[PDB]
């Protein structure tokens, strides 16, 4: 009698009966491959979440589902025997749990109404489902497109008031992790691009902190100053290699230097190069760029 | 009950087997169920694909053939097909030149076809979508966000089918069907409800000489109920609603296959006015005597004439039905010359068949 | 009382006015009413002409055009036309190669068409008749002496229509039609009656899950009423009836235009038997969803194969209706290669449209 | 009496009776402002998590808390009346719930043990707490120090199988959002450094991707080729200016160009520059740098 369920019933009433039940349609293995692959990001987040929830909830009778936007079961875990009692009703990997298929149910009703929804007992349109409680919360993507559901099912006598919020808190973690995970992915792709740029210079380029620690060095300056790219990062410059008079002064004087001839000592070998040095004035102090031009 | 069926769960299978036997130029696939041209993939042209619930026949199954649909996906009676069927069907009909999905504006369909679109894309099938929302009667119905997609889907399937056939690229097909969907206007009435065989009870019930005005094809409530007065009162007020509700602004969503994303697109409909040329479809919703449709048609031409609309072509008959519902829809589609040339172009399907 | 009609005595003049506006390839004559090809008299060919009560649309009006009828005469709803109409129309269509009248076996039709024939003869018009008695269900019904003329009239009008088109002479056309008439077998059933507008009340009433078995197209009583069980076993008994009541000996009379008199001619039908080749027509009686027809067709092809008949062509739709009746008919017509060749010939009528 | 509780009891047994109850120490108003504000990162995420947890759980007798690493209650919500019950014993904003104060309880043990914990009934050291059940999950820090705890308290006879995993599903969201939230902040700082680097080159530099769309333009490419920095971004290269025919052949054939003299046409003006072009072959296709050397 919730205003939700009421509507759901008006949708179901026209086109199905309450006492009939047929095995709900299942996407056949091969094309289930493409359905599952399409969600690797969501599923690898959602599974971790569900293995943990299960881990601190076992023993108990219930199952945990991750569905996609179409109400298709992507993966199931939880109590072995409960997954099997539901499996005995046709709830399997790749089963579609849409409203048109199995009637009114949180598995489909949450996505429809756009928020966490719990259905139990004879709220469900089909009678087969009457000794079950279902909790499900939908999750959205970067754009705001419904992109899956987390659901929890258990024998109706056993639902607890924490069951709904449990699915919502998990939907929150997976949804919220996708969005910020993909914002990382982007701002990381941006780094690789901006690096590949500096990796592609003509000049050798090295930069360091106001404190004196190497920040950036490219393959090219790595060869020229015979430093190891990785092992160099964050390490103090003067401990990395001994600098020529002119540079000492120009670091100190915060002065610029244009195409100056300069001699560096790396780990006992001396390297002659022609350099350009530029102060990068900031609030926290001055950084520097040194460019090693290839004669 | 007056259902010509056997077991209630077999009705769809029986009827699909019947269709395939009757028309050997079509192929019935199983696990899952879909229907395509016997000769697909037809390498070279844009594959044209549609579907939705069964119960509307000949739509969409009767419209598979040269110069129209490449294949269809029927689902359950009055129920969207699930994306796996849409997926595999579009993979069966891929022409190498793109696949155009035609989607009637319903919650289930939209969601299901949209996902099937994304599935195909990930599999690297060039694909885009056209959405039909002609039903001028109600904004947000029982199964619809926005306007409902009804009988104008059949004209659009034919016109776009012809462009596909001719040789036009995926883009111009989609742009065409998309223009068309802003020029078609439709409204239906029912004097008797359809019964879906699985529910066993009529999907609504009207009192004596009362009609559901602006009904939809899954037996969704109309604008209201109102006393049925005469065929003339009915065609008049159906026709006045096509003008009054003609002008309409909304957002439709298409798949931009280049960007790999759903591009939203605000667009407006112009209400038919003096000087427009139209195609008119007087459509049996299921159980109206053909005789009567002509009576409707007769009144429709008087109203078009007096409003200054010039009917150029027509279809009269059972083209987009709602099981056994007693009523009819009127579709008017605004046309120019290129459109009529596409109309007259050949078509060879179990339900529309003309031209060399 | 759910009819889309206006004034109850105007029903027909609106419907026909609509038909004429829908199809400029047709001419509606006023005072009296009949319909002809917009281009008659078509000089050089046997003009082919038929008619009966209205209420069977598209039969006969929907079959006027190239490769079928030249013109048709509708009467009131479920009433035969009058001689003055038949006469006047048959003279509008006369090409110079004589005129062939196709008549369904019903008292009123037989009587009126006969008298029109004589009328025509006396006006110096070569003219002859084919009589259709396919309905195998009952002998001597309410409006018929012997076997009623139902859906097979459509096939015969098509095959004969196509022979006339080619160049075949009046006798050649006539004997084709007679030959075909001893090869067609029809049966229909009803789950709910039609209602004629003027009457106001259903033309019979069935209790729950009861069917009128062997119904006729004016809502005549059939063999009996019997519990409708399932579409399967309905098609089954229908099919067995077609075989059992296939053998049939009787007297039909045609117009010997040479001697100027009615030639009595006794003639026999052969049951359809193992090895035969058929066109099958699964025909909606008015208000059966097309979808269920394909279910009926599905079972038919199973029964046909089981009894060694080969379905070479089919038609599935509303071809010969009974106003708003819920029921269908099955026709089977034995063919050979000459016959199929005539079937595949062009036809361009509003209700049948294939070929170049 | 699992080892965990058993151990905790050996700590309390030495210094504390099972029947006496002192209202635990609460931080003064002024200084609790600084305690709270120090946690704004954690709290703005958590309070959101919990508002949701609560809305979809109401009505139920329980309270949810977020505490910091010293077990200080930072914010609380949930059932008005349960809050009041706990408040009377002295669980308030600013109250410290450490083990040495209120005895063995999940509010402290969770953190001590490093994982989600639930204590109910007489597992608690102090009898006052015997008609409560407490679930708590510790949550950790970018570099992995304890950073806080999410807790649920309710009347002992009403705990559910789902209560512990609910606090875990919340700590997970808050923890993981904090973790990647600061991964994001650091790869964003790196992004700026790398920028500030390219920005203070000697040449102008430009790049586009495999689709041919500007990705980076610097202050000196922007002056020289007469482009507005921001509005040029993302936009297709051949629409942005007329590429000399040399460039087009070298992007079509993907060849490099050393110090080539070429004419650019930007918006009706002809510009001369000497250019280097380098392919950046990657797995989705080839990007390019263009450098513009000053004469």
CB contact (8 A) between residue B15 and residue C234: no
Domains and CATH numbers, chain D: 1-179 (3.30.450.40), 202-295 (3.30.450.20)
* Three-class SS state of D80: helix
Residue D57 contacts A, CB cutoff 8 Å: yes
CB contact (8 A) between residue B298 and residue C208: no
The answer to the question of residue B3 being in a domain is: no
Q: How many angstroms separate the most distant Cα atoms in chain B?
A: 56
CA C245 to chain centre: 20
The answer to the question of residue C33 being in a domain is: yes
Of all residues in chain C, the one with the smallest CA distance to B326 is C2
Chain B touching partners, 3 or more CB pairs below 8 A: A, C
Instruction: Dihedral sign for Cα D90, D91, D93, D94, please.
Output: positive
* Three-class SS state of D53: helix
Provide the domain count of chain C: 2
Taking alpha carbons only, the member of C124, C100, C113 closest to residue C47 is C100
In eight-state DSSP terms, residue B48 is E
The answer to the question of residue C3 being in a domain is: no
Pairing of strands C71-77, C47-54: parallel
Token reading at A260: 């100056």
Token reading at B287: 């159980």
Pairing of strands A132-140, A146-155: antiparallel
Domain boundary among B134, B159, B183: B183
Domain containing C283 — which CATH number? 3.30.1180.20
Token reading at D13: 């047994």
Q: Give the CA angle between residues D49, D51, D52 to the nearest 5°.
A: 65
My answer on whether B147 and B68 are in the same domain is: yes
> Which neighbouring-strand residues pair with B287?
none
CB contact (8 A) between residue A56 and residue D164: yes
Partner B, chain A 18-57, Cβ-Cβ below 8 Å: 20, 22, 25, 27-28, 31-32, 34-35, 37-38
Place of tokens 């706990």: D86
Q: How far is CA D129 from CA A117, D83, D85, D120, in A?
A: 34, 14, 12, 8
Distance CA A139, CA A80 (A): 26
Distance CA C57, CA A24 (A): 43
* Three-class SS state of D125: coil
Q: How far is CA A257 from CA A213, A286, D200, in A?
A: 20, 15, 13
Place of tokens 């579907």: B51
Element (H, E) at B282: strand B277-284
> What is the CB-side half-sphere exposure of residue D72 using CA atoms within 13 A?
20
My answer on whether C175 and C190 are in the same domain is: no
SS (H, E, C) C59-85: CCHHHECECCECEEEEEEECCCCCHHH
Taking alpha carbons only, the member of D223, D229, D211, D206 closest to residue D289 is D206
Distance CA D76, CA B53 (A): 51
SS (H, E, C) chain A: CCHHHHHHHHHHHHHCCCCCCCCCCECCHHHHHHHHHCCHHHHHHHHHHHHHHHHCCCCCCCEEEEECCCCEEEEEEECHHHHHHHHCCCCCCCEECCHHHHCCCHHHHHHHHCCCEEEEHHHCCCHHHHHEEEEEEEEECCCCCEEEEEEEEEEHHHCCCCHHHHHHHHHHHHHHHHHHHHHHHHHHHHHHHHHHHHCCCCCEEEEECCCCEEEEECHHHHHHCCCCHHHHCCCEHHHHCECCHHHHHHHHCCCCEEEEEEEEEECCEEEEEEEEEEEEECCCCEEEEEEEECC
- Spatial contact of D74 and D43, defined as CB atoms under 8 Å apart: yes
Q: How far is CA D112 from CA A209, C207, D8, in A?
A: 39, 80, 9
Contacts of C108 (CB under 8 A, 6+ apart): C53, C79, C80, C143
- Spatial contact of A67 and A74, defined as CB atoms under 8 Å apart: yes
Taking alpha carbons only, the member of C297, C315, C314, C313 closest to residue B17 is C297
Distance CA B38, CA B49 (A): 14
Distance CA B66, CA B208 (A): 45
My answer on whether B85 and B190 are in the same domain is: no
Domain containing C106 — which CATH number? 3.40.50.10440
Residue D270 contacts A, CB cutoff 8 Å: no
Place of tokens 């919703």: B285
CA distance B38 to chain C (A): 18
Instruction: Dihedral sign for Cα D93, D95, D97, D98, please.
Output: positive
Q: What is the resolution of this structure in A?
A: 3.2
My answer on whether B234 and B333 are in the same domain is: yes
The answer to the question of residue C189 being in a domain is: yes
CA distance B74 to chain C (A): 12
C209: left (phi over 0), alpha (psi -120 to 50) or beta: left
Q: How far is CA C112 from CA B9, C80, C108, in A?
A: 50, 7, 6
Cβ-count burial C70-91 (b if 16+ within 10 Å, e if not): bbbbbbbbbbbbbbebbbbbbe
C-beta contacts of B21-29 below 8 A and 24+ residues apart: B21/C297, B21/C298, B21/C301, B22/B350, B22/C294, B22/C297, B22/C301, B22/C314, B22/C316, B23/B350, B25/B65, B26/B61, B26/B64, B26/B65, B26/B350, B29/B88, B29/B89, B29/B92
Token reading at D7: 């151990």
In eight-state DSSP terms, residue B135 is B
In eight-state DSSP terms, residue B2 is -
Q: Give the CA angle between residues C13, C68, B355 to the nearest 5°.
A: 95
Residue A253: CB atoms within 10 A of its CB come to 10
Instruction: Determine whether the annotation assigns residue C355 to a binding site.
Output: no
> Which neighbouring-strand residues pair with B187?
B330
Contacts of A229 (CB under 8 A, 6+ apart): A217, A219, A222
- Spatial contact of A92 and A108, defined as CB atoms under 8 Å apart: no
For residue C28, the enclosing domain spans 11-183
Pairing of strands B99-104, B47-54: parallel
- Spatial contact of C303 and C274, defined as CB atoms under 8 Å apart: no
Residue A32: CB atoms within 10 A of its CB come to 17
Contacts of A254 (CB under 8 A, 6+ apart): A279, A281, A286
- Spatial contact of D8 and D99, defined as CB atoms under 8 Å apart: yes
The answer to the question of residue C302 being in a domain is: yes
PDB experimental method: X-ray
Calculate the dihedral angle through the C-alpha atoms of B188, B191, B195, B201, rounding to the nearest 10 degrees. 130
Q: Residue C8 — φ and ψ, nearest 5°?
A: -70, -20
Domain boundary among B156, B183, B210: B183
Token reading at A224: 């020229």
Distance CA D70, CA D100 (A): 11
CB contact (8 A) between residue C15 and residue B294: yes
CA A166 to chain centre: 20
> What is the CB-side half-sphere exposure of residue C65 using CA atoms within 13 A?
19
Distance CA C13, CA C5 (A): 11
Q: How far is CA B152 from CA B58, B288, C61, in A?
A: 14, 19, 27
| Residue numbers belonging to the annotated binding site of B | 53-56, 104, 109
* Three-class SS state of B179: helix
Taking alpha carbons only, the member of C130, C111, C131 closest to residue C170 is C130
Q: Residue D13 — φ and ψ, nearest 5°?
A: -50, -35
Q: How far is CA D235 from CA A40, A108, B197, D213, D222, in A?
A: 31, 42, 57, 5, 14
Token reading at A237: 């410059």
C56 is catalytic: yes
Distance CA C311, CA D282 (A): 62
Q: How many angstroms separate the most distant Cα atoms in chain A?
A: 92
> What is the CB-side half-sphere exposure of residue B227 using CA atoms within 13 A?
2
Q: Is residue C95 exposed (0-12), middle (13-18) or buried (19+ Cβ within 10 Å)?
A: middle
Domain boundary among B161, B183, B205: B183
My answer on whether C173 and C228 are in the same domain is: no
- Spatial contact of B65 and A81, defined as CB atoms under 8 Å apart: no
- Spatial contact of D74 and D36, defined as CB atoms under 8 Å apart: yes
Q: How many angstroms separate the most distant Cα atoms in chain D?
A: 91
Taking alpha carbons only, the member of C159, C121, C139, C154 closest to residue C254 is C121
Please pick, among C23, C56, C60, C185, the residue that the annotation labels catalytic. C56
Pairing of strands B224-227, B210-215: antiparallel
My answer on whether B349 and B333 are in the same domain is: yes
Residue A202 contacts D, CB cutoff 8 Å: yes
My answer on whether C239 and C310 are in the same domain is: yes
The answer to the question of residue C111 being in a domain is: yes
The answer to the question of residue B84 being in a domain is: yes
Distance CA A136, CA B326 (A): 40
In eight-state DSSP terms, residue D17 is -
Cβ contacts (< 8 Å) between A162 and chain D: which residues?
Answer: 57, 160-163, 166
- Spatial contact of A142 and A182, defined as CB atoms under 8 Å apart: yes
CB contact (8 A) between residue B119 and residue A34: yes
My answer on whether B208 and B353 are in the same domain is: yes
Calculate the dihedral angle through the C-alpha atoms of C244, C245, C246, C252, rounding to the nearest 10 degrees. 160
My answer on whether C25 and C169 are in the same domain is: yes
- Spatial contact of C147 and C114, defined as CB atoms under 8 Å apart: no
The answer to the question of residue B4 being in a domain is: no
- Spatial contact of B131 and B103, defined as CB atoms under 8 Å apart: yes
Distance CA C239, CA C233 (A): 10
Q: Give the CA angle between residues C337, C342, C343 to the nearest 5°.
A: 95
| Residue numbers belonging to the annotated binding site of B for dihydroxyacetone | 53-56, 104, 109
Q: How many angstroms separate the most distant Cα atoms in chain C?
A: 56
Distance CA B87, CA A37 (A): 14
CB contact (8 A) between residue D165 and residue A166: yes
Distance CA B199, CA B197 (A): 6
Distance CA D37, CA D167 (A): 23
CB contact (8 A) between residue A27 and residue B118: no
Taking alpha carbons only, the member of B88, B76, B74, B205 closest to residue A99 is B76
Distance CA D168, CA C228 (A): 62
In eight-state DSSP terms, residue D264 is E
Q: How far is CA C151 from CA C49, C92, C133, C186, C310, in A?
A: 16, 26, 10, 7, 20
Cβ contacts (< 8 Å) between C52 and chain B: which residues?
Answer: none
Pairing of strands C99-104, B353-354: unpaired
Q: How far is CA B166 from CA B267, B342, B345, C65, in A?
A: 27, 9, 9, 29
My answer on whether C176 and C211 are in the same domain is: no
How many residues can be counted in chain B? 356
Distance CA B60, CA B69 (A): 8
Q: Is residue A295 exposed (0-12), middle (13-18) or buried (19+ Cβ within 10 Å)?
A: exposed
Distance CA B294, CA C36 (A): 17
My answer on whether C150 and C206 are in the same domain is: no
CA distance C135 to chain B (A): 21
Taking alpha carbons only, the member of B166, B32, B35, B51 closest to residue B93 is B35
Distance CA A13, CA A51 (A): 38
SS (H, E, C) chain C: CCCCCCCCCCHHHHHHHHHHHHCCCEEEECCCCEEEECCCCCCCCCEEEEEEEECCCCCCHHHECECCECEEEEEEECCCCCHHHHHHHHHHHCCCCCEEEEEECCHHHHHHHHHHHHHHHCCCCCEEEEEECCECCCCCCCCCCCCCCCCHHHHHHHHHHHHHHHCCCHHHHHHHHHHHHCCEEEEEEEEECCCCCCCCCCCCCCCCCEEEECCCCCCCCCCEEEECCCHHHHHHHHHHHHHHCCCEEEEEEEEECCCCEEEEEEEEECCCCCCCEEEEEEEECECCCHHHHHHHHHHHHHHHHHCCCEEEEEEEECCCCCCCEEEEEEEEEECCHHHHHHHCCCEECCCCEECC
CA distance C86 to chain B (A): 21
CA D175 to chain centre: 7
> What is the CB-side half-sphere exposure of residue C297 using CA atoms within 13 A?
28
Q: How far is CA A269 from CA A225, A264, A266, A294, D21, in A?
A: 9, 8, 5, 18, 73
CA distance A163 to chain D (A): 6
My answer on whether C162 and C215 are in the same domain is: no
CB contact (8 A) between residue C2 and residue B192: yes
- Spatial contact of B159 and B48, defined as CB atoms under 8 Å apart: no
Token reading at B239: 């026709």
């Amino acid at each position: 009698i919730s205003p939700l369920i009421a509507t759901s019933w008006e949708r179901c009433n026209k086109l199905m009966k309450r006492e009939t039940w047929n095995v709900p349609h299942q996407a056949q293995g091969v094309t289930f491959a493409s359905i599952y692959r399409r969600k690797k990001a969501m599923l690898t987040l959602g599974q971790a979440a569900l293995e943990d929830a299960w881990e601190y909830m076992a023993p108990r009778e219930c199952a945990l589902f991750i569905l996609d936007e179409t109400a298709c079961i992507l993966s199931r875990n939880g109590d072995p025997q409960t997954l099997q009692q539901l499996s005995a009703l046709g709830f399997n990997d790749g089963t579609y749990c849409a409203e048109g298929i199995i009637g009114t149910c949180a598995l489909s009703l949450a996505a429809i109404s756009g928020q966490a929804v719990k259905t139990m007992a004879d709220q469900h349109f089909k009678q087969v489902l009457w000794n079950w409680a279902f909790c499900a919360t939908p999750l959205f993507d970067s754009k705001g497109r419904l992109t899956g559901t987390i659901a929890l099912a258990c024998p109706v006598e056993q639902t607890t008031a924490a069951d709904l919020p449990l699915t919502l808190a998990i939907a929150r973690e997976v949804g919220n992790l996708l969005l910020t995970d993909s914002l990382l992915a982007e701002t990381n792709r941006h780094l690789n691009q901006l690096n590949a740029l500096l990796e592609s210079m003509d000049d050798g380029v090295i930069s360091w902190d106001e404190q004196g620690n190497l920040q950036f060095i490219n393959a090219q300056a790595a060869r020229v100053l015979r430093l190891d790219a990785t092992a160099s990062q964050g390490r103090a410059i003067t401990e990395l290699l001994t600098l020529p008079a002119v540079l000492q002064q120009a670091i100190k004087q915060a002065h610029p230097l244009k195409h100056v001839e300069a001699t560096f000592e790396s780990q006992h070998q001396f390297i002659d190069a022609v350099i350009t040095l530029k102060p990068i004035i900031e609030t926290q102090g001055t950084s520097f760029i040194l460019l090693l031009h290839p004669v | 009950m007056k259902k010509l069926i056997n077991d209630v769960q077999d009705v769809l299978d029986e009827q699909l087997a019947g269709l395939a036997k009757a028309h050997p130029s079509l192929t019935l696939h199983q696990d899952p169920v879909y229907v395509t041209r016997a000769d697909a993939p037809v390498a070279g042209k844009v594959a044209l694909l549609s579907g939705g619930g069964s119960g509307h026949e000949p739509m969409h199954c009767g419209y598979i053939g040269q110069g129209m649909l490449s294949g269809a996906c029927p689902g359950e009676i009055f129920t969207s097909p699930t994306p796996d069927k849409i997926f595999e069907c579009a993979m069966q009909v891929d022409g190498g030149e793109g696949v155009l999905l035609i989607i009637k504006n319903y919650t289930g369909d939209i969601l299901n076809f949209e996902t099937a679109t994304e599935l195909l894309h990930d599999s690297g099938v060039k694909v885009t979508t056209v959405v039909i929302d002609d039903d001028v009667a109600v904004k947000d119905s029982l199964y619809t966000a926005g306007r409902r997609g009804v009988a104008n889907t059949v004209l659009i399937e034919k016109l776009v089918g012809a462009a596909a056939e001719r040789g036009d690229s995926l883009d111009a097909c989609a742009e065409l069907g998309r223009k068309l969907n802003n020029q078609g206007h439709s409204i239906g009435i029912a004097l008797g409800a359809c019964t879906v065989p699985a529910a066993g009870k009529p999907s609504f019930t009207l009192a004596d000489n009362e009609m559901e005005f602006g009904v939809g094809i899954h037996g969704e409530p109309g604008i209201d109920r109102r006393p049925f007065s005469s065929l003339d009162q009915t065609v008049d007020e159906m026709f006045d609603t096509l003008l009054v509700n003609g002008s309409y602004h909304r957002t439709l969503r298409f798949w931009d296959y280049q960007q790999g994303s759903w591009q939203e697109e605000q667009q407006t409909k112009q209400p038919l006015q003096s000087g427009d040329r139209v195609i008119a479809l007087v459509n049996n919703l299921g159980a109206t005597p053909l005789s009567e449709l002509y009576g409707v048609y007769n009144r429709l031409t008087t109203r078009c004439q007096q409003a200054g609309l010039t009917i150029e072509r027509n279809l009269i008959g059972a083209y987009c039905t709602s099981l056994d519902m007693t009523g009819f829809s009127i579709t008017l589609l605004k046309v120019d010359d290129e459109t009529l040339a596409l109309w007259d172009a050949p078509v060879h399907t179990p339900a529309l068949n003309w031209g060399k």
